Design a protein around this ligand. Structure first.
Ligand SMILES: COc1ccccc1C1=C(Nc2ccc(C(=O)c3ccccc3)cc2)C(=O)NC1=O
Length: 291
C-alpha cells in the first residue's frame, strides 16, 4: 500500500551523507531533489519475500503512527534489489550522540522532558499493541524545537505479527527487560508490553550517567548480570531528586506483572507536572553551538 515500484528513488532523492551501517544494510541522509526536505533513508538489499515481510511491517508501523513523538514515514520504494524506507530526519540527532558531543549527561530537567515525551509515545504505541522492544538513548532522536522522536522500529517490526518470539539480537542488550533475558513467553501473558517500561528506566539512567548500567563489564556477562542483579539505580543519589529515584524504583520492577504501565507512570510526580520542552531546546541549542 505504501511501497511504490514504478518510480526510482535515485531520481527523487539525493544521498547526501551516510548515517549508519551494519548487517541491516545502511541508513543514509537524503535530500529530495524537488523539495529539498531531508530524510533518513534505510536501504535494505534483499530479494526473499520472507525477509521483505519484516521490513514492510516497519513501514506499516510508521504509517499508522500519527503521534508527533514517533518518526514519520515520508515514503517507501522498492525497485532494483533494494527497499527504500524514507523517514523523518531529526537534525538534533540521537540523545546518546548529544551526550558524547557535550561530554556530559543530561540534567534532571532535561531527563524529565525526555521521560515525559517517551511515556506519551509509549502510551500511544501500546494502545495499538505496538511494542518498541529496543529503546535506548540511541533511539531517542531530537528535533531542533526540543521534542523527541522514537526511532528504529526494526526489532518491533520483526516481532509484531508473529507469535514466535525472535530470540535473536545484535550487539549488547543493556536495555533488555529481565523477563526477556530469561526468554519468557510474554505473548501468552498480559505483560508483553511491560518490557518497554523497563527499557525506559534503563534509558533514563543512561542519560543520567552517559553510559547504561553494566557498560563497564565484559559485554558477554551483561545478560547474566541483568538476570541475576537487583534493579539498577542512580549510583550518585545525592545528585538527583527523590522523585527521580522513586520513579526508577517503581519502573525498574523485575516482575513484569507489577511493573507500572506508561499511563500509570504519567501520574508520577517525576513527570506529572512536566508541560514544557524548554530544557531540551536549550540542550539542542547547546549541542548545535559545539559543532
Ligand atoms: C536512531 O535513528 C535511526 C536508527 C535507525 C534507522 C534510522 C534512524 C533515523 C535517524 N537518525 C539516525 C540514524 C542512524 C544513526 C546511527 O548512528 C546508527 C548506526 C548504526 C545502526 C543504526 C543507527 C543515528 C541516527 C533519523 O533522523 N531518522 C531516523 O529514522
Amino acid at each position: 500500500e505504501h511501497v511504490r515500484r514504478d518510480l526510482d528513488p535515485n531520481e527523487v532523492w539525493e544521498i547526501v551523507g551516510e548515517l549508519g551501517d551494519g548487517a541491516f544494510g545502511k541508513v543514509y541522509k537524503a535530500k529530495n531533489k524537488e523539495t529539498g526536505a531531508l530524510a533518513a533513508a534505510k536501504v535494505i538489499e534483499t530479494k526473499s519475500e520472507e525477509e521483505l515481510e519484516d521490513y514492510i511491517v516497519e513501514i506499516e508501523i510508521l504509517a499508522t503512527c500519527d503521534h508527533p513523538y514517533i518518526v514519520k514515514l515520508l515514503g517507501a520504494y522498492y525497485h532494483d534489489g533494494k527497499l527504500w524506507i524514507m523517514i523523518e530526519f531529526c537534525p538534533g540527532g540521537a540523545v546518546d550522540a548529544i551526550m558524547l558531543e557535550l561530554d556530559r549527561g543530561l540534567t534532571e530537567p532535561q531527563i524529565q522532558v525526555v521521560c515525559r515525551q517517551m511515556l506519551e509515545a509509549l502510551n500511544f504505541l501500546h494502545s495499538k499493541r505496538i511494542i518498541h522492544r529496543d529503546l535506548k538513548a540511541g533511539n531517542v532522536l531530537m528535533t531542533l524545537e526540543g521534542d523527541i522522536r522514537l526511532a528504529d522500529f526494526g526489532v518491533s517490526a520483526k516481532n509484531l505479527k508473529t507469535l514466535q518470539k525472535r530470540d535473536s539480537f545484535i550487539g549488547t542488550p543493556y536495555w533488555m527487560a529481565p523477563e526477556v533475558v530469561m526468554c519468557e513467553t510474554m505473548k501468552d501473558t498480559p505483560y508483553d508490553y511491560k518490557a518497554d517500561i523497563w527499557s525506559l528506566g534503563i534509558t533514563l539512567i543512561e542519560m543520567a550517567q552517559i553510559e547504561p548500567p553494566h557498560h563497564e563489564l565484559n559485554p558477554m556477562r551483561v545478560l547474566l548480570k541483568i538476570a541475576k542483579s537487583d534493579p539498577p539505580t542512580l549510583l550518585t543519589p545525592s545528585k538527583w531528586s527523590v522523585e527521580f529515584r522513586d520513579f526508577l524504583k517503581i519502573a525498574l520492577d523485575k516482575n513484569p506483572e507489577t511493573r507500572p504501565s506508561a499511563a500509570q507512570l504519567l501520574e508520577h510526580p517525576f513527570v506529572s507536572s512536566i508541560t514544557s520542552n524548554k530544557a531540551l531546546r536549550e540542550l539542542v541549542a547547546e549541542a548545535k553551538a559545539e559543532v
